[PDB]
Amino acid sequence: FSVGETTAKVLKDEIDVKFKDVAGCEEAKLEIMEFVNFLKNPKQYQDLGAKIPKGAILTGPPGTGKTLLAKATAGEANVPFITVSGSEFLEMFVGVGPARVRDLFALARKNAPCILFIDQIDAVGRKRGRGNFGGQSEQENTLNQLLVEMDGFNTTTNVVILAGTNRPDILDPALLRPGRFDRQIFIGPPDIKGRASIFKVHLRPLKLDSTLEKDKLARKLASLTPGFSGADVANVCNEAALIAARHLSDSINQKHFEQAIERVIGGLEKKTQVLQPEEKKTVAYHQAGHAVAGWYLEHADPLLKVSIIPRGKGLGYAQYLPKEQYLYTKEQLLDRMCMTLGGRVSEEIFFGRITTGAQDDLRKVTQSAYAQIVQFGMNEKVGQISFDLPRQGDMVLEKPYSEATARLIDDEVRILINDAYKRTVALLTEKKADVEKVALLLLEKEVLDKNDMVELLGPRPFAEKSTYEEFVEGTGSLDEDTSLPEGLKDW
Amino acid sequence: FSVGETTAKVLKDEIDVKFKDVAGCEEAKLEIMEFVNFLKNPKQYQDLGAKIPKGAILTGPPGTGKTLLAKATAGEANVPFITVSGSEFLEMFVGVGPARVRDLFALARKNAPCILFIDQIDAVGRKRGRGNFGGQSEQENTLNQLLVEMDGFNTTTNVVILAGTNRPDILDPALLRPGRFDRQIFIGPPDIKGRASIFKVHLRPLKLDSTLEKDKLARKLASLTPGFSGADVANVCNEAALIAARHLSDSINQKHFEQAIERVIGGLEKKTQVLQPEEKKTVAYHQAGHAVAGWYLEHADPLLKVSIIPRGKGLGYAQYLPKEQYLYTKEQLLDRMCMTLGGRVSEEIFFGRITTGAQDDLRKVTQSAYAQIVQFGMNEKVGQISFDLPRQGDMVLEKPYSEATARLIDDEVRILINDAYKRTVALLTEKKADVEKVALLLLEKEVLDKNDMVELLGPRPFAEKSTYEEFVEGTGSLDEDTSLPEGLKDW
Amino acid sequence: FSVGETTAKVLKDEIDVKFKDVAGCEEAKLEIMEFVNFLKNPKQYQDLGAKIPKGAILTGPPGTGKTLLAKATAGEANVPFITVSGSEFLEMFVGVGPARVRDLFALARKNAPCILFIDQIDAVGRKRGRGNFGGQSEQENTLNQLLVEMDGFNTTTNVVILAGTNRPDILDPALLRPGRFDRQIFIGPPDIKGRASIFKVHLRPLKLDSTLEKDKLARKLASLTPGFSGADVANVCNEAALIAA
Amino acid sequence: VGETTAKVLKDEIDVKFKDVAGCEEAKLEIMEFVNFLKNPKQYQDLGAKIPKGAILTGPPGTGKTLLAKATAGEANVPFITVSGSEFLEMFVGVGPARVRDLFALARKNAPCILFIDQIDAVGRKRGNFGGQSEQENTLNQLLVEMDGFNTTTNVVILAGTNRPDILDPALLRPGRFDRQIFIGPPDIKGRASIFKVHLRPLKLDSTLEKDKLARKLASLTPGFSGADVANVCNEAALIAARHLSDSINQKHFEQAIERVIGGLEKKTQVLQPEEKKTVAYHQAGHAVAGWYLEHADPLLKVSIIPRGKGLGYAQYLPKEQYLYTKEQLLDRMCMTLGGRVSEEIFFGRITTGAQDDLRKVTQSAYAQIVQFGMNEKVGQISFDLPRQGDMVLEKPYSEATARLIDDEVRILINDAYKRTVALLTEKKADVEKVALLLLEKEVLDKNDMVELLGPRPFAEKSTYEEFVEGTGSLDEDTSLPEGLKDW
Amino acid sequence: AAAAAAAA
Amino acid sequence: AAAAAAAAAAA
Amino acid sequence: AAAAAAAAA
Amino acid sequence: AAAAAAAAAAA
Ligand SMILES: Nc1ncnc2c1ncn2[C@@H]1O[C@H](COP(=O)(O)OP(=O)(O)NP(=O)(O)O)[C@@H](O)[C@H]1O
Ligand SMILES: Nc1ncnc2c1ncn2[C@@H]1O[C@H](COP(=O)(O)OP(=O)(O)NP(=O)(O)O)[C@@H](O)[C@H]1O
Ligand SMILES: Nc1ncnc2c1ncn2[C@@H]1O[C@H](COP(=O)(O)OP(=O)(O)NP(=O)(O)O)[C@@H](O)[C@H]1O
Ligand SMILES: Nc1ncnc2c1ncn2[C@@H]1O[C@H](COP(=O)(O)OP(=O)(O)O)[C@@H](O)[C@H]1O
Ligand SMILES: [Mg+2]
Ligand SMILES: [Mg+2]
Ligand SMILES: [Mg+2]
Ligand SMILES: [Zn+2]
Ligand SMILES: [Zn+2]
Ligand SMILES: [Zn+2]
Structure with missing residues (x-):
């Protein structure tokens, strides 16, 4: 038969x-x-x-x-x-x-x-x-x-x-x-010099302003997109045109690309805010705890947009610029824990009432305190021992060590988080006026620029790098060299 | 071939x-x-x-x-x-x-x-x-x-x-x-501004009363149906017409809506399933414990109606108005636990005997105590650690933590509930006479509205919000704006 | 295929x-x-x-x-x-x-x-x-x-x-x-008001004694059958039809 | 049909x-x-x-x-x-x-x-x-x-x-x-005869003999089969004409070996001048530790140019043998821990690098304690240890044994750890030399290690002619029996 | 929780 | 584990 | 994590 | 294949 x-x-x-x-x-x-x-x-x-x-x-x-x-x-x-x-x-x-x-x-x-x-x-x-x-x-x-x-x-x-x-x-x-x-x-997945050339391929059929040259914008857009891939850049070029033409505009501004990034990283920005003024005030003081702790800790990611307008499955978001690194040290991983715990600390200082809104902050602090001890070897007491963690989609079927070791591990996660917790509490209790300044401005503008943080808190006192030319200082070439070998010069 | x-x-x-x-x-x-x-x-x-x-x-x-x-x-x-x-x-x-x-x-x-x-x-x-x-x-x-x-x-x-x-x-x-x-x-799931416009979609084919207006009624029904989904609003609007057509009425009353909100939440209402006179005396003292403790606690839900008629899997029935809020605190969860434990407390002060009727009142207290300790971070001894707590339809394979942590958790749940138990025993002995006032009317009149509990207990000594315009007025829009953008003006 | x-x-x-x-x-x-x-x-x-x-x-x-x-x-x-x-x-x-x-x-x-x-x-x-x-x-x-x-x-x-x-x-x-x-x-499950009515559905095909009233007997068999399901009451009226047979 | x-x-x-x-x-x-x-x-x-x-x-x-x-x-x-x-x-x-x-x-x-x-x-x-x-x-x-x-x-x-x-x-x-x-899979006698088949259709350099090189390529390629040998002789010709070179030299074969087991030598990757200094101080700690342990494998090539799933690599020459003693397994643990130790001495900070190093330290020490008899306190027992990736069903031993096992593995790793910390602290200036030469050249060969550290202080085996003296035939033989007089 | 009761 | 039959057709 | 958040009830 | 002994990425 013909199959x-x-x-x-x-x-x-x-x-x-x-x-x-x-x-x-x-x-x-x-x-x-x-x-x-x-x-x-x-x-x-x-x-x-x-x-x-x-x-x-x-x-x-x-x-x-x-x-x-x-x-x-x-x-x-x-x-x-x-x-x-x-x-x-x-x-x-x-x-x-x-x-x-x-x-x-x-x-x-x-x-x-x-x-x-x-x-x-x-x-x-x-x-x-x-x-x-x-x-x-x-x-x-x-x-x-x-x-x-x-x-x-x-x-x-x-x-x-x-x-x-x-x-x-x-x-x-x-x-x-x-x-x-x-x-x-x-x-x-490519690096920043690779993403900057993937933007040059896909900014090419768009229609930008009389300003916004397609070469200098691709360097800016690869800065704002750490960790993306060859197809995540393809939506940021595409869905910035669908935002530019939803408002019926003539040419795609820079403000339309940033609304295409934050849609993919975050989610649907809801127009009708529904929160009461006693529970929008709690989200405002919570998001200022992510803002100020990320602003005063070295190795914490740069801040872009603190917003208490609900987006996605959250009541607010923070929009960090994650440092595209390949080697996290021990102190760099602590200042993510001391930042992710920063929202609940600001609730606890101002109100004295812990809430259930910090549930996703605590799951991150949990999983970045077990991977340091079990998966990595960051703990002296457990030893220089690495295992494999079950993922969230993976189902925990049997733990591959003794219960006397898992008793030792859980006693050390609890010391690690409490060391990360006491550092944040002793960070946002002398910066209590600075958390007060941020979240009161969140209750009118409902978003914050990075420039709004500069006008309010001052320059960030740490060696912060944000643009493309200060991310690609080390290689000294400034662009992905598409140079061909001598036997490949038919293209 | 064929397939x-x-x-x-x-x-x-x-x-x-x-x-x-x-x-x-x-x-x-x-x-x-x-x-x-x-x-x-x-x-x-x-x-x-x-x-x-x-x-x-x-x-x-x-x-x-x-x-x-x-x-x-x-x-x-x-x-x-x-x-x-x-x-x-x-x-x-x-x-x-x-x-x-x-x-x-x-x-x-x-x-x-x-x-x-x-x-x-x-x-x-x-x-x-x-x-x-x-x-x-x-x-x-x-x-x-x-x-x-x-x-x-x-x-x-x-x-x-x-x-x-x-x-x-x-x-x-x-x-x-x-x-x-x-x-x-x-x-x-929709919010309260979102829900009132879902009523406007489904109050549209109904023949309401000549007094009721479909804009004011859609706001009222969204305030009376908190936490519902989008397909629940389609059921409340449907079954209020079916209730109106059992009574051969020419137009759907607002009272026909309140019998549909109760029927979806509560279940079928058995009037003929009679109890013994020493059983109704027990059920009335149990339901008056839910009524009076829910009346005098601050962060408990506002009450609608308490019945002792068998409704579904249950001998009594209480009807609450859950507060639409997204940030439960530590006190707002204790007052929900002290209200649920109030049923066993009242039939233990009055009788001395405790029954098996508080089984489903204890499954809510147990699941709301693991959730504070395991899943949220509401505890000091366990620490600020979050774990994915298994649901009822999730056959748990193995715990994501040790056994000495599971020993630490189940100790703290016992400390939590027995502090919620002693807080309610200290409540329904100070208010012991008021529980007897409520349940003696429950044996006479098998239901109690909110009005005839104001006639017993006076006005409730806390500020309670009850209308749509009171649930919304903090924001400043009063409606859900269906304002399409400039480039979508074909609809 | 048949499956x-x-x-x-x-x-x-x-x-x-x-x-x-x-x-x-x-x-x-x-x-x-x-x-x-x-x-x-x-x-x-x-x-x-x-x-x-x-x-x-x-x-x-x-x-x-x-x-x-x-x-x-x-x-x-x-x-x-x-x-x-x-x-x-x-x-x-x-x-x-x-x-x-x-x-x-x-x-x-x-x-x-x-x-x-x-x-x-x-x-x-x-x-x-x-x-x-x-x-x-x-x-x-x-x-x-x-x-x-x-x-x-x-x-x-x-x-x-x-x-x-x-x-x-x-x-x-x-x-x-x-x-x-x-x-x-x-x-x-039916209570005794419930299943006395369930007997009256199943006692009406049976031929009873000349002294037993169906209004009285269904009240009494509901007292002699506590906690039965509805299907059990339908067998009590059926097993005794076999015993009399 | x-x-x-x-x-x-x-x-x-x-x-x-x-x-x-x-x-x-x-x-x-x-x-x-x-x-x-x-x-x-x-x-x-x-x-x-x-x-x-x-x-x-x-x-x-x-x-x-x-x-x-x-x-x-x-x-x-x-x-x-x-x-x-x-x-x-x-x-x-x-x-x-x-x-x-x-x-x-x-x-x-x-x-x-x-x-x-x-x-x-x-x-x-x-x-x-x-x-x-x-x-x-x-x-x-x-x-x-x-x-x-x-x-x-x-x-x-x-x-x-x-x-x-x-x-x-x-x-x-x-x-x-x-x-x-x-x-x-062949040993190194038979493998050099496989290279002689596939060095044959190549236009090599005039200063290379097709038998002195086939012994050199068999020395650099242990454990390969008859397909990996035919690939290196093909990839090094494709690497040669990529640059329009006139003839294939020895540097092209050393990259085709480096291509197959390494990955993709890519230069367009961006690394900060601090994250190269961490990797260079890391993989000098693997290089010096394998240089100074008796039973460690001899060093072949260390580089910090990224290869796919790695920031750097250290190509070794694995000693193709059948039996491992207790201290031949100790010197591999002391070498695999060596990169993490060198990050601690030079910096004081501990990276998420050497995560795959700490896996091998675990899955050796678990196999060493459990399924051999290498520990006196656990005893002369052997258990079918479930492999990683497959589900673990239920342990074949008690919880008190698993407490005894996991407390001895922690002793075994710290004994491997303290020996490396004692090694790479006495030899601290030699790890400084190997790393800064990777910080400017980015690839080190064994010849660059001998010129920098002197000869290795142990009776090593690297040359093909010293790999072959264990039998005494000195060359792989192809001869016929007396009953096979038609071939 | 919109409903509390005494179960059978 | 559920089966997925690979049906060999007959004449 | 590119952005932290404040989750729902 | 043979011994590689890489330094992997963690991003
Ligand atoms: N390096 C790149 N440069 C430009 N566009 C790219 C690049 N990589 C991916 N894309 C875009 O992504 C889409 C195709 O992605 P592709 O690399 O083919 O992913 P893929 O992995 O092969 N698909 P899948 O096998 O299902 O994962 C197209 O829209 C391309 O424009
Ligand atoms: N936003 C809404 N406005 C009006 N009616 C709605 C809305 N959401 C749901 N409904 C009603 O709910 C019914 C079921 O919606 P439907 O989308 O089919 O279920 P669902 O939300 O998709 N969940 P599921 O399909 O089971 O995964 C619809 O037929 C409507 O009557
Ligand atoms: N002894 C050898 N000498 C030279 N080249 C060899 C040798 N063995 C294999 N090769 C090369 O490998 C190719 C195919 O080898 P092959 O016998 O197909 O491997 P294999 O053992 O059969 N693997 P498989 O296909 O799973 O059976 C040949 O065309 C040669 O290029
Ligand atoms: N309330 C009732 N009145 C009369 N007969 C009943 C009643 N309940 C059950 N029965 C008897 O029991 C059988 C009902 O089947 P059942 O076992 O209840 O189905 P299911 O197992 O799906 O509930 C019928 O044969 C019927 O005669
Ligand atoms: Mg594809
Ligand atoms: Mg559907
Ligand atoms: Mg074959
Ligand atoms: Zn109850
Ligand atoms: Zn948060
Ligand atoms: Zn390493």
Whole structure:
């Protein structure tokens, strides 16, 4: 019967995504261009005896441009290109699966120099288990067919097998070997020089003011977006136009991008405030505790917008600028705990009445006091011992140590938080006038600029860095260098 | 072969739900009116270069208007509208999950500016786990096929992919990313300004009295129905017409509304299930303990009506007006516990015997004492540590802390409740005569309103707010502004 | 395949169960005759601007006459009556549960003014949680398909979604919200005023002694049967029919 | 359907027996299989039943398919190949019918090799449902015609899979797949012969000899299979023509090794001048600690240029051995703790770096206490310790034992910790030298360590010619027996 | 909590 | 654990 | 955490 | 593969 078709389209549509659209992942797009550089100019490589590399895996967190980097190859390489998804092989029969990979490559041999792309390969790339559940056997037959066809008998050349997944750890080591997938490319979330070039790709079809050059704005916008990815930048460019045209404006201001950031980080800003003046006053004194403690602690994040207008599932928010770091020390993690506890401390100093509104502040202080002790080794008494924590979605099934150790751990979380708590109480009790100044201004303007904090408290007394040019002081290059090697100068 | 089609329905019935039928949440409407305003006025959005957003997720508690806000989207938009559920994809075989997602996007992209709705996406969008049982195998092949169709090579423009869910936290981060679901919309339960405009939607088909006006009545019913959802207001408006039609009345009275608020909260009201004369003497002393302790405590709820007639799973019944407030303090939770324990206290002062009737009064006190100590930070000995406390339908596997902490918690719950118990025993002995006044009328007149408890106990010695205009007047708007922006002026 | 259909039989025959045969639930028969009073006289309710409630739930201990009170709701309005159990959904395969909810409501609309009774709904109506156990995620699929077919798109009118249960505490908040189950009705065990009336329903086919009055005997057997359920009283009048036989 | 989807291939494949080169004791036993087809006399002189074939087993990337390619080219007999997954079809009755057509194809080309790659797609544990009964009748069809070769004189059937455990024991009876040629990962003698195959088609530098380099590349690459060796010889050619270089030099091979196990050498990453100073002082603490412990692995390359999931790395030369003493495990704990110690001496602050260092300190010390007998107080016990990632069900020992275990692991780690703090404080100026040279060069080799610290004070082993003196042959040998005079 | 009672 | 059958079709 | 908050009831 | 001994990221 005619269920033997590969359901893979030989991509004939001219995709208009060149390699100039794929920014950020600079050293990852170089190793995809060498697939194109080989098929277009084989003389540079065949004079050194270099065979064609067989394939590649594109790994990374989701939303990083490992499908977009495959879209660039379709629109640039002049070879035939076909696409297929990793969950298209299995259907409701026994032969289908293995009889569908065999016609994926028999199609890919009729197109002799072609490149094929398997998206979400972890649907048929799962590691083979023992004699087990009956649905697992059909996945192993489809995988074992895929392994023979990529490296074995009747394995042709000139077929580059690109592949993409975001769970490479569940993959079979028979796929991960060279000869099947010669390169494993990890496309991680880019840094600030990478995000600044992803803004340059997507600010390009917008319409900015007579001011706001698209080059200097991309440096500003990557500063305000720490920790984003290749697709989180794509909404901030997009949804700032949908805010610019909701108010029926002619060109996108800078004030429309910041309302596109805070919508994605925060949530729906509710227009009708509903709180009574005795419970808007409590949220105001609470959000001033996040403001002032974050303002007077070194290693705390810079402040952008304290607002008691309800947003998302909260009654207020703080809008910090998280320092895009890779190594947290012990004192940097304490001043997040001494800041996240800062809201309840300001309630307790002014009112004397703890509330239930600090529930999400305490869950953060809990999880950043267990990960320091169990997961990290920040505690002298437990020791230099690291474990694995169960996540929130993960379910706590059995604790992997003794209850006499868990008695020791919980006695040390309680000392760690109380040391973080007494520091904040001894911080907001001499700055009691400064918390008073912030939250009274919150009860009229209902938001605060960072400039409003400067007009009220003064300059922040710590070595604060906020702009792009003072985040990229260290590398000394000021821009993501898209310089090509000498064998890659056909682009 | 036979199994595999998408079983979707390109709906042809003109849905009579407009955006005016959705109230309470303009901040969620406005980000879904931007999808229809794109499909009616593309020139406004494309003069700034704005692409269409590729979809949106609708999160929230049950009964907040998430399927209704998708019905309104099929109302005004002049495009076809395709509807599937989440659970429609998996059926009994392997591969028929991903083979049915592809046929969904076959029918979707066949219509060019279509809008697609996946109701209850938790059946498919469940997070991809590691190596486990084979039931998670064919679910993740259906999720990965979805993620290829949302953002891949076979991804055309102007196909809006809406979806609604109750459980956001179990969803896959690859599914909730920008590019798959650009907008993340949380529709919470409505506030009091939000609720009065939901009454205006559902007081619209009713035949009320000639005295009652639909604007003043919608404000009154929102003040009498605190904490309700959006689908509760539709039930109070429905059953007040059904109560009015049992009594053969020509028009719906306000008294017919107050019998519908009581029927939804309380349950069925058994008048014929009689008790013994030594049982009614016990139930009346139990319910007078809830009445008098709720009367003389400050932060307790204002009382509406106390009955001794059997209502549902219960011999007595009390009817309270819960204060709509978002920040419970430590005293406002003790006074809710001292009111709930007042039933056992009163039948122990008068009789000496304690019954099994205070079982459900003790399950509320227990759950409100773990929540202060474990989940909030309301305790000194445990510390300011927050844990995810398991619900009633959550079979707990193992505690997230030690055993010497669980010994520390259950000691502090005993100290907490026995301080709430002694505070109520000291209350209903100072007010011992007033409890006897209330229950002797309860044996004569089986219900007591608020007015005939003013006739017994005088006015309540605390300021109590009771009307809409008193619940709202601190803010300064008095209504919910449905003021659409400049670029949305087509509605 | 034969696995996949809803296996719910349609009692489109005129059911001989009336509200005359249900006793002890006088305050709960009034909430359920409103569903029948809507289907007989819609004009009485639509002048005020009322709608039918979409379905009611029947909580209480087993044997208190929930199916008997549901067959009386169909036998008055001459509507078809579709029986299904809450344990008939959990087939050992995957996705057969949602495949039988979609077939149940398709049968509930081919017969359009019908009254649907889902017996023991707490087997597939248990509260949805996180990754508890292997096989628990199939109940959550069957529950989410039940949520869509009741209050969502493809929602019909003139169906009464009745459902009996014993443990309403373990039910999902998404089922118990108004819109799915508009009326929550508790049917407790009968007291002695309650089940003396239940004897009079079942003593009238029997031939008694010439000295025993049915007004007197049903008062006395209700004293000699404390704490029985409604189904037990129906066996006391049936076991003694066997003993006399 | 019924189509056998096999290909009678007689093509002049460029795979010879000179292309296998390192599985030599596994090489002669397939030369014996060619001897069965060409000479049915000298194996029937002693009344020996000629076996039907072997199953090529081993880790992936080793040679269990290439050695079947070399049989097709070297032996003049025709060759037919399938995979195991090509047999199961939609219709019931095709799977146990293609195996007729495969074994009937082997009769029309009668003296033949017949290779079934990935045989674990057919050979499985039998069982039930009709989908499991299909591969039951397919595997039974394989066993019937395997035994039915008594009429023919010469049909040999090879097989190759990387999972011999899942195979049905009905395949392993006499008269069937008798031998199990285990093709395993080579030692450094056989691995240098693998580099000589793949240094052959390269245009190398003129100052490099293709045998002095193949011994050097086998020295720098321990634990690799036959696929990781063919990749380094291919990646270093692709690295060469990336820069339009004239010929491949030694620096290109040292990067292709560094590419495979390291990640992606990326320069565009931004790091503050304080967060490079923390990483440089970190991984000098791993470099000096492995330099001064006797049983630590010798240092190969330390860099702070980011590689995917890491800010820096320290490539080592793992001593490929089979037994670990109690102090050979102590010096690895004292080295893995070394980076965290150096952050504490130079700074006084403790980072979330060395999180993956502290995992290895835990999962060694747990395995050392629990599932060996390395502790006197816990005793001579061994427990099936559940691996990380899998769920832990219930402990096989008491809570009082788990209190005793977790109090001794804490003693074991602090004994590894105090030894490193005593090491990297006496040697404090030497960690200062190694780190500041990483702070300006960002990559250090072992040659940069010898020029900075002097020679390592221990009788180390790094050269290939001192790796080989344990046997005395001094080179890997390829010779034939006396009964194999046709190859 | 909008309802308090004496359970059976 | 729930089963997902892979149906081998008959003649 | 990019932004702290004050949660609901 | 072989020994890598990296310094991972924590962001
Ligand atoms: N480096 C980048 N530069 C520019 N745009 C990018 C980049 N990475 C992602 N995008 C945008 O993100 C979308 C595609 O993201 P992509 O990198 O393909 O994520 P993905 O991981 O492959 N999708 P998935 O496999 O489901 O996780 C498009 O809208 C791109 O414009
Ligand atoms: N904001 C609102 N305005 C008016 N009616 C509303 C509103 N919210 C809910 N309703 C009513 O509630 C009913 C059910 O809404 P619906 O959206 O279907 O439930 P839901 O909020 O989506 N929860 P669920 O669909 O079960 O996940 C609608 O038919 C309306 O009658
Ligand atoms: N001994 C060897 N000498 C040289 N190259 C080798 C050797 N073994 C493997 N290779 C290389 O690896 C390629 C394929 O090896 P192969 O035998 O397919 O590995 P494998 O053990 O079969 N892994 P698998 O596919 O799971 O069975 C060959 O084409 C060579 O490039
Ligand atoms: N109140 C009642 N009046 C008369 N008969 C009753 C009553 N309650 C129960 N019965 C008898 O018990 C049976 C009711 O079935 P039941 O076991 O109550 O269903 P469920 O287990 O779903 O509640 C009927 O046969 C009926 O004769
Ligand atoms: Mg992708
Ligand atoms: Mg819905
Ligand atoms: Mg192989
Ligand atoms: Zn009570
Ligand atoms: Zn807060
Ligand atoms: Zn390290």
